[PDB]
Design a protein around this ligand. Structure first.
Ligand SMILES: Cc1ncc(C[n+]2csc(CCOP(=O)(O)OP(=O)(O)O)c2C)c(N)n1
Ligand SMILES: Cc1ncc(C[n+]2csc(CCOP(=O)(O)OP(=O)(O)O)c2C)c(N)n1
Ligand SMILES: [Mg+2]
Ligand SMILES: [Mg+2]
Ligand code: NA
Lengths: 802, 802
């Protein structure tokens, strides 16, 4: 247990804590200006001149003094209440407030010992910000206290609410840009309070950083009427509180005492909710939220060159951009930095004075030290059930190609038992598609968590106020809740229709960037559990939905996060349920990855046994020798290779026909796609030797790919024999139609694959046969048009091993 | 002018209009069930049996009777008020309601003459729905009345509000799923009423289709308290009205008269707002919105096999899934279809009776006929200013490589004059980045439109209640507002930081799917203006922001919409301002495309004159003969090729050094990326002959690519000489650092490009020189680390032609 959660003070905030927070706000504003502007002379010691100013002024002042004021007060709250706390910096461009926080709390020098608490360390700390060889301008993963960089805005609320799930002792003050609140993902993030339980989850306090402006415009929420702004928050289930300061001549000590009093009223309401939830965990409370309305750039010069800067969008990035180049801007910078009175905040040796930090929390309650902001320190491996009990044993009993299993059901049973063994640390998220993607075996041991109105057992099923599955129709919510659930040390999986994974392409990009920077250079940030995404209800079988639902291209996005032997991204094609089991175990043991797990939810054959899946998964691609009919590679006339459930079923039927014609081939199944890349691009890929053993040195290779052929063409560009591959993939053809027609129109059906194999072997010899196969594809299409189902010769085919 | 806009009735709705709407609702519910369930016998004529039921039951009933009821009432409104109207079907899976609407209004048989108004046409209409060789299950572009398919949910509101911009006569009732309202893009779409003006724009009426459920869960908005739901809408600037029906035994005629009365009160409020805005166009009104709370699946069987189906998520997809297979489900289907009393709705010949449609609008006011739902019928070409006045004439006057122009400023001036010449039909959208991306020359002739609070001329600049630029910090809003502005017949452009274009990858996928289906098979849907996106503030120069802002990969997404010689997608690399001008003119003349226009906003050289840009753009890739030093292709030792402003600047400096060494090369610039694909993949690409003329038949090619190398490797896989290309691209390296360091760490700097050229020519001979160049890259990096700016030898370089 960290601290003493949800305790009220029952005395006023002390005057010493008020004095300490004003000194914090002054020193963190002074050091944030020093990080943006100074390359030397951090204490302005004689002579202080333009030569001490950076030659490239980069970074963002406007948000920063607001964040520094909130951080003084959240620090005071943590210390006085001993409250386990992680904050979220929505305006992540306020990086200097997050680095200043960790430098004051002492974690900065603990994690970066060269950056010491004295004049030399402070000089290094100022220069390194947003500087070559230095550190980022945002609240990046290399800053203690960060689980959210806030560069791509929108995800502050889903991260906050995912951090509190199953974390009943944790408070998260979530600071949200008022410009960020104009994004789609932030606007739906406020609704998450219908999806957490005040007994079994922790508490988010949204703090809208309503400083009036974004980069070059006012914000929508700051300029609507105050009545509308409070109705809006009350309508989303909050009790809004509003604080306004800095627009008049109120002295800063008075401002701190009024804010401390308000924050204590808010925290007491949060403690009342937490106490009441011990008894009534079914009534959803109106959780507090705070509208914090202060001038953008607060405390900077009111006008610069005749233009209003404090209280304007003009304060967003770098005011005084000529500070190194003109004596006029320099004297303004000098007066601005002097206004914080640093001679009162630092000792002669350059260390921040004890009276500046006496009010701060200590130990693991410090924002920079709390293990929830470095969740791999808390993470334990999952207690996994043995995988063999889930195996589809039909392949062993009856043969390769057996049955009509819906593959994700085996993963549903495996996840049900992972939840039973890990009942508060593994969650499932889905955008109203957990049952549609066939993971509903999980409801045998838990419920979908819904903290909103119930009506009747005739409609509400598998649903309760606490539970380990969460659904909302928003891929941004599912991906963001899971990312923070992992960042805080826990585990989970989500599923999405494949075409709609694209809604969250950019969130995958950012969490991959967070992993890239972590595995490269932040070894104190310990490994977290991977993002596991079941990508299902895929392009080949959108029977009720059609063309808008046909887009497997998240493969191509994921390929753009495969560099530097970081190994943070995996793309897996589950050939059947036993392959899906073997991939899922590997994913659930893995850390520091995004694992995209492709699997079809339609009834489909099972190709391999579980032991076979385990071996083939490790290599990444495998010959299926029981399907190949060639003696050796030299007798091969064509290599039949596939990745994906439906391309594999059509390739296997093509193999059956080609065997019956007397054609010699081998069959290669591909599961771990990036293992096709060269070793020069991927030091864990097949070697050239192993790749040539599979694909041959010089025989044609027909490759039936689940996604866009471009992916495979690009990945194998420097591989031996790559000129001999013919990659057939989805090609933006399809609608609501029958299973055969959907593969027919992308030349992926068994008949077109058999024709393409013959064209690669001898197009002249097999010209008539290729025409007969193309005519059969037309007869089977007319059959579907006339009859309303596919030709039995297509539907009824079973691999002959069965 | 269409109809008589914004007119009140000042009499009650007639009883004949009530009788007509109930007959519409019955016939459209009956035909929607017929589209999902029947392959023959649409009038249930003796014998009606299981053999008339489809063998594959696909499609979605639950939303559909709600939409059919709203469409009866919107049709009655249009006819009685003569109101120019386009609706939006947010729950686009209710396709059978949109096809039934067009079949009743008569547009279906006008556009599809085989689908006649009689028993044979009705049989064909039932069978073809969601059927092989037939039509989609959603409200696809091939349905008259659609500008929004609604397959990927979320975009109903941004499309509605973009359709009304500069369309002051147009009413848009926007029907929004209550599950769809849980998405990010829909949640921020409600805020668009701060961005339209009630005098100069038209009026959206949001209608929340609050049927209680999504696929397998209740919805957040249906289960929060009613007080919260109305506070929420009032807080977002609406006057909420709520209608509840179908949960008790109220007869349907009574329901229609109560709804007609409410819809008239709402429409009168909208007419009051429109009249008042003629005089006061600065006070933002509280626009009506309608909460429409009815049971999901309304009018279907209350229980099926003991499970509650009407008023449940169970009604979402296909109830009675055994209708063909068991006599029990069949008799339920038979009784359900009989309950609409089709013998009263159709004549003996199968035509819908006159008394069913006498209340409907006629002519171009019909939902299926209105030209705003087929905007290419209204679209006129833009009146474009002559391009030569914008040319950067420095290349002609002083030489190739001249100056420090910020390229988008030339496009800003060109757009300013396009707005002046087309003052109500060309808009700019940006997510608070129009000025940051250097398009603010537009504010010389218009303002950013902001219909929300003003405070002071010291902060509000270039901003007014009417104007032709729109900014909100949401890429979903900008892309959705523009898509509908184009779909309704107008023109425009938006700009985004490159990394964040990814937020709307999935919207690009869907608008490309809408274009694919239109150019393939819907020739009555006339060409619309293209989506033009300036992709700027790119990966090489995110000086204030860093690694989260470094992701040029929308190239790779766009490559997955390049099939079938549809030619709906273009990827352009603007080498400099004159190239950007030539690309922008081509884009602004183009139709039926998505044009992604890559350009850097940093000060940069200008390489080509405007006439040169015009020629080179047409071919797609061009030799720069003034930069090449080789006699002919056979004397070339390496081809130096680049795509993108910064790769081109570094390649040109590498060319200068290589010339000075005595190395023979040629320089090829690539602007129209997909023109590198083979003709077999793209019938408008360079031919093999033209491609070999540029890249040689067998010399090494060093290709400095702006984005991820994978893209170029995949596109050239079947091109002559492709094995000799070495593609250098971004590789997930970088942070907030200097311009040289950012290209250094991706091996893109001039020194690494010169080294790679030497390694391709003779790695043994030039081993020492390659070491010297790699050491210089380390000295220039240490220089930046020590001094805080790049080495003058790097920054001060100018191509020697200048
Ligand atoms: C998704 C996304 N779109 C665009 C941007 C570009 N951008 C960086 S800061 C910023 C304005 C942020 O304004 P606000 O949230 O109000 O922050 P503050 O005023 O506290 O600086 C924008 C538009 C972004 N970072 N993320
Ligand atoms: C962005 C997105 N995510 C997921 C889906 C999958 N899906 C199709 S319908 C649907 C439920 C829609 O519920 P609602 O909007 O309430 O529509 P209605 O109840 O009127 O059928 C979902 C989850 C989708 N179509 N779009
Ligand atoms: Mg702001
Ligand atoms: Mg619904
Ligand atoms: Na090759």
């Amino acid at each position: 247990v960290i601290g003493t959660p949800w305790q009220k003070l029952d005395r006023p905030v002390s005057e010493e804590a008020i004095e300490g927070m004003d000194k914090y706000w002054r020193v963190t504003n002074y050091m944030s200006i020093g990080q943006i502007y100074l390359r030397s002379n951090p204490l302005m010691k004689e002579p202080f001149t333009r030569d001490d100013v950076k030659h490239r002024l980069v970074g963002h002042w406007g948000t920063t003094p607001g964040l520094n004021f909130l951080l003084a007060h959240i620090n005071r709250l943590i210390a006085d209440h001993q409250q386990n706390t992680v904050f979220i910096m929505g305006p992540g461009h306020g990086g200097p407030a997050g680095t200043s926080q960790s430098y004051v709390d002492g974690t900065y020098t603990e994690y970066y010992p060269n950056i010491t608490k004295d004049e030399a360390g402070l000089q290094k700390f100022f220069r390194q910000f947003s500087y070559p060889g230095g550190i980022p301008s945002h609240f990046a993963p290399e800053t203690p206290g960060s689980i959210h960089e806030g560069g791509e805005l929108g995800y502050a609320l889903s991260h906050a609410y995912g951090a509190v799930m199953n974390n009943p002792s944790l408070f998260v003050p979530c600071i949200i840009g008022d410009g960020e609140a104009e994004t789609g993902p932030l606007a739906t993030g406020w609704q998450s309070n219908k999806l957490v339980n005040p007994r079994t989850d922790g508490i988010v306090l949204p703090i809208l950083h309503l400083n009036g402006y974004k980069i070059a415009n006012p914000t929508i929420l700051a300029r609507i009427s105050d009545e509308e702004l409070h109705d809006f928050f009350r309508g989303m289930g909050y009790h809004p509180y509003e604080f306004v300061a800095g627009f008049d001549n109120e002295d800063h000590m008075s401002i701190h005492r009024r804010f401390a009093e308000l924050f204590e009223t808010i925290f007491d309401e949060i403690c009342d909710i937490k106490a009441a939830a011990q008894t009534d965990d079914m009534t959803r409370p109106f959780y507090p939220m705070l509208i914090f309305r202060t001038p953008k750039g607060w405390t900077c010069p009111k006008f610069i060159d005749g233009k209003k800067t404090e209280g304007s969008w003009r304060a967003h990035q770098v005011p005084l951009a000529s500070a190194r180049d003109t004596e006029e801007h320099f004297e303004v910078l000098k007066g601005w930095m002097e206004s914080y009175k640093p001679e009162e905040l630092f000792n002669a040796d350059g260390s921040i004075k004890d009276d500046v930090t006496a009010f701060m929390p200590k130990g693991e309650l410090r924002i920079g030290a709390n293990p929830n902001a470095n969740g791999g320190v808390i993470r334990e491996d999952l207690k996994l059930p043995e995988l063999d009990q889930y195996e589809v044993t039909g392949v062993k009993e009856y043969g390769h190609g057996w049955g009509q299993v819906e593959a994700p059901r085996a993963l549903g049973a495996y996840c049900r038992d992972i939840i039973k063994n890990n009942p508060d640390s593994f969650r499932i998220f889905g955008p109203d598609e957990t049952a549609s993607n066939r993971l509903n075996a999980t409801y045998e041991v838990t419920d979908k968590q819904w903290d909103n109105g119930y009506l009747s057992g005739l409609v509400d099923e598998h649903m309760a106020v606490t539970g380990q599955v969460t659904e909302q129709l928003s891929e941004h919510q599912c991906e963001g809740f899971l990312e923070a659930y992992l960042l805080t040390g826990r585990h989970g999986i989500w599923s999405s229709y494949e075409s709609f994974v694209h809604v969250i392409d950019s969130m995958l990009n950012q969490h991959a960037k967070w992993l890239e920077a972590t595995v490269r250079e932040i070894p104190w940030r310990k490994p977290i559990s991977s993002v596991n995404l079941l990508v299902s209800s895929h392009v080949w079988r959108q029977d009720h939905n059609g063309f808008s639902h046909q887009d497997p291209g998240v493969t191509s996005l994921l390929i753009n996060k495969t560099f530097n032997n970081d190994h943070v991204t995996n793309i897996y094609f589950a050939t059947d349920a036993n392959m899906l089991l073997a991939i899922s175990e590997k994913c659930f043991k893995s850390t520091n990855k995004i694992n995209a797990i492709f699997a079809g939810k339609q009834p489909a054959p099972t190709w391999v046994t579980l032991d076979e899946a385990r071996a083939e998964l490790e290599a990444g691609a495998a010959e299926w020798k029981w399907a190949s009919n060639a003696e050796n590679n030299d007798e091969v006339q064509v290599v039949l290779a596939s990745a994906g459930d439906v391309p594999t079923q059509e390739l296997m039927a093509a193999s059956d026909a080609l065997n019956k014609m007397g054609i010699k081939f081998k069959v290669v199944n591909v599961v771990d796609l990036l293992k096709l890349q060269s070793r020069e691009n991927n030091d864990e890929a097949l070697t050239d030797e192993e790749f040539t053993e599979l694909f041959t040195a010089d025989k044609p290779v027909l490759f039936a790919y689940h996604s866009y052929a471009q992916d495979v063409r690009g990945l194998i560009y420097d591989r031996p024999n790559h000129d001999n591959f013919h990659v057939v993939g989805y090609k933006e053809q399809g609608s609501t139609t029958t299973p055969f027609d959907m593969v027919r129109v992308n030349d992926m059906d068994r008949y077109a694959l058999q024709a393409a194999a013959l064209k690669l072997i001898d197009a002249d010899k097999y010209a008539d046969k290729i025409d007969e196969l193309n005519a059969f594809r037309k007869k089977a299409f007319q059959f579907a048009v006339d009859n309303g189902y596919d030709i039995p010769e297509f539907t009824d085919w079973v691999y002959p091993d069965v």
